[PDB]
Design a protein around this ligand. Sequence first.
Ligand SMILES: *[C@@H]1O[C@H](CO)[C@@H](O[C@@H]2O[C@H](CO)[C@@H](O)[C@H](O)[C@H]2NC(C)=O)[C@H](O)[C@H]1NC(C)=O
Ligand SMILES: *[C@@H]1O[C@H](CO)[C@@H](O[C@@H]2O[C@H](CO)[C@@H](O)[C@H](O)[C@H]2NC(C)=O)[C@H](O)[C@H]1NC(C)=O
Ligand SMILES: *[C@@H]1O[C@H](CO)[C@@H](O[C@@H]2O[C@H](CO)[C@@H](O)[C@H](O)[C@H]2NC(C)=O)[C@H](O)[C@H]1NC(C)=O
Ligand SMILES: *[C@@H]1O[C@H](CO)[C@@H](O[C@@H]2O[C@H](CO)[C@@H](O)[C@H](O)[C@H]2NC(C)=O)[C@H](O)[C@H]1NC(C)=O
Ligand SMILES: *[C@@H]1O[C@H](CO)[C@@H](O)[C@H](O)[C@H]1NC(C)=O
Ligand SMILES: *[C@@H]1O[C@H](CO)[C@@H](O)[C@H](O)[C@H]1NC(C)=O
Ligand SMILES: *[C@@H]1O[C@H](CO)[C@@H](O)[C@H](O)[C@H]1NC(C)=O
Ligand SMILES: *[C@@H]1O[C@H](CO)[C@@H](O)[C@H](O)[C@H]1NC(C)=O
Ligand SMILES: *[C@@H]1O[C@H](CO)[C@@H](O)[C@H](O)[C@H]1NC(C)=O
Ligand SMILES: *[C@@H]1O[C@H](CO)[C@@H](O)[C@H](O)[C@H]1NC(C)=O
Ligand SMILES: *[C@@H]1O[C@H](CO)[C@@H](O)[C@H](O)[C@H]1NC(C)=O
Ligand SMILES: *[C@@H]1O[C@H](CO)[C@@H](O)[C@H](O)[C@H]1NC(C)=O
Lengths: 263, 263
Amino acid sequence: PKNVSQKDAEFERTYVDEVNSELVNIYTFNHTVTRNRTEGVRVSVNVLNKQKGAPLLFVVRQKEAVVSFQVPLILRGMFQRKYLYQKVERTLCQPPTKNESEIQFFYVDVSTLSPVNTTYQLRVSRMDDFVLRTGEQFSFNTTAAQPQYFKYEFPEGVDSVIVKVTSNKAFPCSVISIQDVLCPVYDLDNNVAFIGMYQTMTKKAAITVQRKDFPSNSFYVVVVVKTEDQACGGSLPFYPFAEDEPVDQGHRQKTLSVLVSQA
Amino acid sequence: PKNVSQKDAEFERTYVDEVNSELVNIYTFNHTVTRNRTEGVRVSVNVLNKQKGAPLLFVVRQKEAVVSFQVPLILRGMFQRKYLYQKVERTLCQPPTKNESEIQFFYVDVSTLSPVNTTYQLRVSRMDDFVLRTGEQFSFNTTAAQPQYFKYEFPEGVDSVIVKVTSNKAFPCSVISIQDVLCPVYDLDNNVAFIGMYQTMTKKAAITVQRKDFPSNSFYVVVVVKTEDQACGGSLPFYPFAEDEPVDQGHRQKTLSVLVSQA
Ligand SMILES: *[C@@H]1O[C@H](CO)[C@@H](O[C@@H]2O[C@H](CO)[C@@H](O)[C@H](O)[C@H]2NC(C)=O)[C@H](O)[C@H]1NC(C)=O
Ligand SMILES: *[C@@H]1O[C@H](CO)[C@@H](O[C@@H]2O[C@H](CO)[C@@H](O)[C@H](O)[C@H]2NC(C)=O)[C@H](O)[C@H]1NC(C)=O
Ligand SMILES: *[C@@H]1O[C@H](CO)[C@@H](O[C@@H]2O[C@H](CO)[C@@H](O)[C@H](O)[C@H]2NC(C)=O)[C@H](O)[C@H]1NC(C)=O
Ligand SMILES: *[C@@H]1O[C@H](CO)[C@@H](O[C@@H]2O[C@H](CO)[C@@H](O)[C@H](O)[C@H]2NC(C)=O)[C@H](O)[C@H]1NC(C)=O
Ligand SMILES: *[C@@H]1O[C@H](CO)[C@@H](O)[C@H](O)[C@H]1NC(C)=O
Ligand SMILES: *[C@@H]1O[C@H](CO)[C@@H](O)[C@H](O)[C@H]1NC(C)=O
Ligand SMILES: *[C@@H]1O[C@H](CO)[C@@H](O)[C@H](O)[C@H]1NC(C)=O
Ligand SMILES: *[C@@H]1O[C@H](CO)[C@@H](O)[C@H](O)[C@H]1NC(C)=O
Ligand SMILES: *[C@@H]1O[C@H](CO)[C@@H](O)[C@H](O)[C@H]1NC(C)=O
Ligand SMILES: *[C@@H]1O[C@H](CO)[C@@H](O)[C@H](O)[C@H]1NC(C)=O
Ligand SMILES: *[C@@H]1O[C@H](CO)[C@@H](O)[C@H](O)[C@H]1NC(C)=O
Ligand SMILES: *[C@@H]1O[C@H](CO)[C@@H](O)[C@H](O)[C@H]1NC(C)=O
């Protein structure tokens, strides 16, 4: 039958491994959390082989929710366009814990059904600046297939805050959303407009957050980068009308500086 | 390590199996398709044990896309409400094939991390009436966690069609969308308003579809059932304000009759 291999891998290490229609890989990750100090976990993977038919299939499994994606991931534009991305990065949703110190386990499983080998490099990073401190600026890089989000913990005596996010290069377009702390977090392109307050931005954005709307005394600031700059007001490129041929967008990235300040 | 079991199960059979934090089950399904005759596949599963902490995790894997969900699935309402559902049913997205006759494989994997056993019944049904014939009425049942969709093949000489969907009982509310034929199909509640033309309905809806907007000469009619009837105009129930306690909605269902007619 199918050959499944397992490993108890660790954080902060890039594993380069092969896979095919026969091999399925499993990685187990242990993680330590405390109620007072909460910190996020980022799963980032890249593929160094160009395949168009059968992509790699990745699943990240937790105690509560399951996330999954295929890579090279294909996004959508306007007129039936296809953009191909090789590196995908996503931050997991961790529910608030009950006990003071509970060790949390999560799994990453890799598979595919293409008949030929394919190499991927996978790593998990314990994100140090998951929390946003008041009056401090944080600069970070986001692409269309690397959504990010940070947790703001409302402090005592603060009735409302204002989240200000700025960029120097106007393009690409992006969407900045404020959401409650409850799994799951809609950081994908298609579901970023379901709940929360969201603004489309190209260079600057500012959203006012109030505590009465968030009974859990915290929220998530989610940043997503779009593929086509039509919404932000740009001119769409005149790429050939390839209905079933995906074209790469090259190196499209956005550097964003975020600061949460008391109102 | 983790114990993984595998089985080459068949269509039209309900398998009742146990699982825990140690067991992971794999089912392989073979499926036969032809270019002229395309027909959908439905994966339907139920859980007969009541668990609130650690749910069952299900993944359905294809050659192209991967879908995943946790059950009993928790949906969202308006004021931080939680609705729990035990049975989940979903139809897979099958891309149009190239060769005249190609056998397609797809896998269903089941796991969980709860320390106690849990029993699930899983079945796969080859949906006979995946296609919609012109001038014919089809009646079907949908719930909030059982989205459906049917493929309409535009015939020769038809410039445009009109899709008319009706119901007798006004509630629950539902969303009816028309989308192009391209994996994936957004049949979930959070992404049903990304692409395509969609109408919210309670008793009747009608959408006009044109061929010039669909170069592939086919489309998908997707039906989704909401949880709260506020959008359709109903009065929300005065359930207790349970922020972290999910309440079941009972037996909420909608019977819908759909007909696609030439304009
Ligand atoms: C989390 O899991 C990792 C993976 O096994 C543990 O890392 C091992 O720790 C032992 C104990 O010192 C070492 O002997 C091994 O060499 C480590 N493995 C590797 C690959 O370096 C880690 O200890 C676990 N965390 C905790 C808190 O126990
Ligand atoms: C965001 O991306 C930019 C561009 O890739 C990074 O700027 C580069 O940083 C490296 C490492 O310091 C330098 O070697 C390059 O010369 C820089 N290039 C440019 C054009 O500035 C930037 O460091 C990234 N930001 C973060 C936080 O990683
Ligand atoms: C698809 O897979 C099923 C699962 O094995 C196959 O069903 C078996 O078919 C053989 C051949 O007649 C029988 O001897 C077994 O008893 C069947 N098992 C079950 C569980 O049904 C099926 O044949 C496969 N399809 C094709 C076209 O080969
Ligand atoms: C949709 O659901 C209704 C209600 O469950 C089904 O109606 C039942 O059908 C069964 C089987 O024929 C009967 O034994 C029940 O008496 C019916 N109950 C009612 C209230 O009508 C209906 O058959 C379902 N539709 C489909 C296509 O499965
Ligand atoms: C199955 O695959 C695993 C993973 O590479 C390997 O360690 C094992 O030897 C394989 N078993 C057989 C019988 O080939
Ligand atoms: C966490 O913080 C609270 C108050 O901020 C404190 O009472 C508690 O002791 C802290 N937890 C630990 C493990 O120190
Ligand atoms: C906290 O830990 C104790 C023992 O370590 C356990 O009995 C209890 O169930 C834990 N709390 C939760 C909410 O799981
Ligand atoms: C994948 O690579 C290994 C080692 O390079 C090789 O033994 C194996 O045959 C390759 N897979 C296939 C399907 O050829
Ligand atoms: C591992 O689990 C499988 C699935 O139930 C079982 O068949 C097998 O005997 C188990 N192996 C051991 C060593 O317990
Ligand atoms: C499929 O239909 C086309 C025209 O409708 C026909 O030419 C072709 O022979 C059909 N395929 C098979 C396998 O009969
Ligand atoms: C169709 O089948 C033949 C052999 O049966 C194979 O060589 C060919 O690659 C198949 N077509 C596609 C598009 O894969
Ligand atoms: C699950 O059920 C089987 C048979 O009923 C039993 O042997 C096993 O111990 C159960 N699992 C646990 C964790 O007790």
